[PDB]
Symmetry: D2
Subunit: 369 residues, 4 copies
């Protein structure tokens, strides 16, 4: 009503926004609409640094050059410890295969995520340790692309020790951007970067908020090629109308005939289930069918979709088990701060019982993971 701002905060007011989140959402939405440029605008405004956002190799050399050899020696020693510890941890996450029942093989794998973003608030000693842990653990984890960002100091750039640590510990990209804009830049794959799948590293409450919002918190997908039995594919897609209030489902195939025949068969099958308004509604709100050219196309699609439930009804099940990388529970065949943080745990199973072994069954129940 009245209120008169005798001061006014240059980033947490009202007449700027009401709440930390109102700001954070506003900013993320702005950056998401705008892209590289709106990110850059926020960076300029908040960080006040007019050097490049992604450090060029020369800048890295110049940064590393400013680090006393004593501090470098220290950093390599801390690095040594962390990476040795992490590779220990990583040995415990070996692939498993268990014939739970004769004829049925269940497995697990630890898969590294594509890209990790590591936020570093600055160049303090605690921050250098932070940067080492995060970049080193993410590297040993096997992430294909690691970004380290730190809010620059004006005219100074990224704290030089942060640059050194990031570099020796395995960071693919070193970024001069902080806070909400920085987090978004990694999250959204701005500036030609890949989309960070995990984002680790301490930060102030704006940074913590965008992160809870962006990375905090059941899809189903069926991969089928021309050999898939159109009856079974349509049956499965229909049974996604039991727990299918929500529950998106995708069909990824390389065969036109199959897909069109399935959209075809839906009216006959939806009809033959209380349920059968549900099912129909679900189908055209959530279900999606995608045509592919070759099998690699299907697999890459599947991966970028990272489905919670994955069924493979195609030839060469061995290939599909080898290739596919992002899923929750994979069923092959119609007849069906620590390294851990940077990894998917994926579970798969193939086959159907080719006999009966009650002792072995019960032993499996008792065992599990």
């Amino acid at each position: 009503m009245t209120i008169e701002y005798l001061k006014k905060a240059s980033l947490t007011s009202k007449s700027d926004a009401s709440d930390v989140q109102e700001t954070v959402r506003a900013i993320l939405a702005d950056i998401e609409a705008g892209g590289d440029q709106v990110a850059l605008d926020y960076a300029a405004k908040f960080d006040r640094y007019e050097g490049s956002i992604i450090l060029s190799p020369e800048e890295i050399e110049a940064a590393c050059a400013k680090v006393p050899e004593k501090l470098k020696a220290d950093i390599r020693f801390a690095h040594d410890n962390v990476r040795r510890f992490a590779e220990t941890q990583k040995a415990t996450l070996t692939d498993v295969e268990l014939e739970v029942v004769p004829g049925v093989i269940t497995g697990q794998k630890a898969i590294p995520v594509d890209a990790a973003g590591c936020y570093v608030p600055g160049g303090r000693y605690s921050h250098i340790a932070s940067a080492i842990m995060t970049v080193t653990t993410a590297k040993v984890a096997g992430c294909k692309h690691i970004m380290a960002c730190s809010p620059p100091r004006p005219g100074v750039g990224v704290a030089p020790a942060i640059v050194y640590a990031a570099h020796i510990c395995g960071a693919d990209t070193i970024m001069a951007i902080g806070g909400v804009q920085g987090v978004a830049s990694m999250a959204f794959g701005l500036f030609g970067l890949p989309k960070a799948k995990i984002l680790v590293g301490p930060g102030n409450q704006f940074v913590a908020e965008a992160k809870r919002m962006l990375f905090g918190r059941t899809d189903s997908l069926i991969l089928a090629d021309r050999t898939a039995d159109p009856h079974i594919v349509t049956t499965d897609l229909v049974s996604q109308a039991e727990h299918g209030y929500n529950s998106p489902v995708w069909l990824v195939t390389d065969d036109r005939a199959l897909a069109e025949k399935v959209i075809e068969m839906i009216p006959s099958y939806i009809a033959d289930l209380v349920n059968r308004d549900n099912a129909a509604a679900a189908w055209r709100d959530y279900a999606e069918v995608i045509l592919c050219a070759d099998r690699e196309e299907m697999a890459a699609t599947s991966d970028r979709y990272a489905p919670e439930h994955l069924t493979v009804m195609a030839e060469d099940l061995d290939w599909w088990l080898d290739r596919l990388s992002c899923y929750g529970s994979l069923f092959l065949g119609e007849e069906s701060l620590s390294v851990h943080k940077y990894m998917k745990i994926v579970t798969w199973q193939r086959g159907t019982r080719e006999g009966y072994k009650p002792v072995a069954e019960a032993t499996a129940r008792i065992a599990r993971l």
Copy 2:
């Protein structure tokens, strides 16, 4: 190089990404965008806020067998809730000689109750959430339910919501409905809590808005600007700060004083302090104490210090805070209640046993 042979209406990659798109769009757009998404997803050609007439007609459509069923479940939930709420009396405790700490349960201004349909589980849910929110004492209860085309909100839901105390019955579902309650669209208050089951979209748009610090000093003409300035300056020990006053004079004197105090610190402290004051602190002028307190509550600060006359009035009136320090000196009703803690006074002597006893809890 991929082809969509069949597409789903609900074009984005992921639920969170989609939810954000809708939320951000609606936040800028207001009622009209909310309605737009209502049109698209809800597929229903009626008003969003049900009129007394619409309520009456819906009420008329529920068999008397079901009405009595709903009234009986309501009776049960109400005596149970009223029982619990009787256990939440203000307590104030002379913890150590001279320092009195207290606790209060205060009901939040507005609750949103989501009701996904008219199956018995949903009707139960609606009674549960709306009855409890009512008993807790929420000043405004919104019940919204996904409307079905031509039919509206399941008439049983209307009956339940209405008898159980809902102030607003809304024919809007999913992200648009959640947004409508959260942001105070259609003249409604901004829902502080949102309860009730929902699809994964409803749950996500809810984690964002309600899932997950700030400090304030309330001062009037009697506050001594030295203590106020020290107290605010020591906020560089990040985290926003407010000074809320009704005294034009006081405000400007403190605003004059800060850099002189910033100079008193060791050099690790001084850069941080200057930046913190620069970036996060804000000073606000109000007409009278009533004004000030209302401002304070709308800010709901984690730390609240009161440097004003008539502390008794301040303790009674102030409602939304984390910890209140008065003076320059120092499924269940619980869900709908914020627990506030206040402290008054300073140590009066030293009592080892009482202190050691306090240490535990």
Copy 3:
């Protein structure tokens, strides 16, 4: 062939292998021997020759030695802790829920008969401990509170601890420490009741004795008077071999009637069930003959059954009387928290069908 150039008065080999082993030894000796052996172990370990249970006079004389600055301090802390506790205890009401028409479930918080509070000494933290536990045990509503603290030779219990224990509600103040003290409360020595819960910090021996005696189910009991249908008790009793089971009755006839009926009901079970059931009946089941309803109730309570079924007249009486059990089913048809048993009861059968009321009742718990 190893030589002990110095031995521990306690944790030595040839005196025992392990703390746990020593604790077992003492508890066993005390449990068999009783009062005198407890006393002898007190003599051995505390080395103090005043009364074990302080007389009222000893209490007053102990109180008199507490500087009044400290008395007032203790009184003040006690006031806060009581004022805090009564808040929580007000949160433990009696409930009643019509889960389905005709079937009413309950809960109650019941205070245990006797609670024991250990106090390891007389420092300020120890005093706070005593104030905490004795005060809470009183607010909770335990009929008998025993506080013991290890005596200091010639001195007795720390005067501050006597004052705290007394004003906070302790019914008994005991000058005994360690395993012998814990056992004295646990085993109801010296005319004291058997402590149901034991709270309070202590050395490794005290903690071990508490782990064994008070640390930590699907036992079963049926109360029947002559009205119970013998077929029904027989079925329910065998149904535990599907874990101790008791039939507690006051009508001799029923008991004998059911005993003879048992084997035919064992026979008319599938083939895996029959041997297991026969074994269980002889090995885990008991039939106990009582005088009247009263005796049965007292029996049920002393056994503290997890599952309790009442097949008698005046189900309201049993709901009123029976107060040590887990889950009560009446009829053939069917912080302060530490000091209390939570009992849940139900009566009745469906007398109707209210789908909403039922769904909401489902939520009230789940």
Copy 4:
């Protein structure tokens, strides 16, 4: 005023009041009586007229009565569980870390001396449990594995349980059940080793017996002729400071040192403040022991047998002590400073800080210490 129309086989009253009471009674009886009292309970409750520890003859005879289908089943279960276990065990290699320059902390998993495995009978789930537990303990590296199952009258242990136990790696198969069987493994009766761990499902009696015996800080200093009497005496006195109820041991092979330490103790109790002086004098009297051994081997053997939570070694040939000592909690070398359930995790460290390096410190601190 009660009359017992039917009594349960030692579940009744004036037998006992309680499950816990019965278990304590039976356990106390067995600790006193030994083998013979254990046997008494066995005969009484189990009512089985054969031997307790199966001979190779009885084992092979038992094996012979198992249908070849079930043998195949069990072998398939064993093979799965074994391969899985050895995968997990490969992850448990000894690790060594220079957390700070000059300060080396390590971790290792030690297999326990003896695992006892309870098997309640011969039902399918029970066979899975037996395979599961005995195989896991075998892979873990238990030097001695005891399997016991209650014998059935005239038959003995279910031949199936004997088969699983034997192929899965069991060193001893026991025809004894319930409390008496838990007791027999736990107390090392019948010439058997004392079971350090006890795994396996069982009735209320068995579960309480194993809660009693296995449910839920001691200190030891190993010193040889080279240790500093002042250092030892101060640590032992400072073990009567914040841990004066916690037992303390001095294990040495040099009489001279020990005698000197004992003579120094009271003068050191004298030179500290009086809140301390009574507590310490008491603590030394009540909890401290000084044990003289013939040689260092006797020392390490004592140490392991005592299995101390805190262990400090003030002797020469520190590398040897690190290699030799097996059962401790935290080992401090030098005067300066799933297979899992079947294994002790021991942490050791040697050296002192021995430079600075602020980053390594900060990294070690965030690393949650240890």
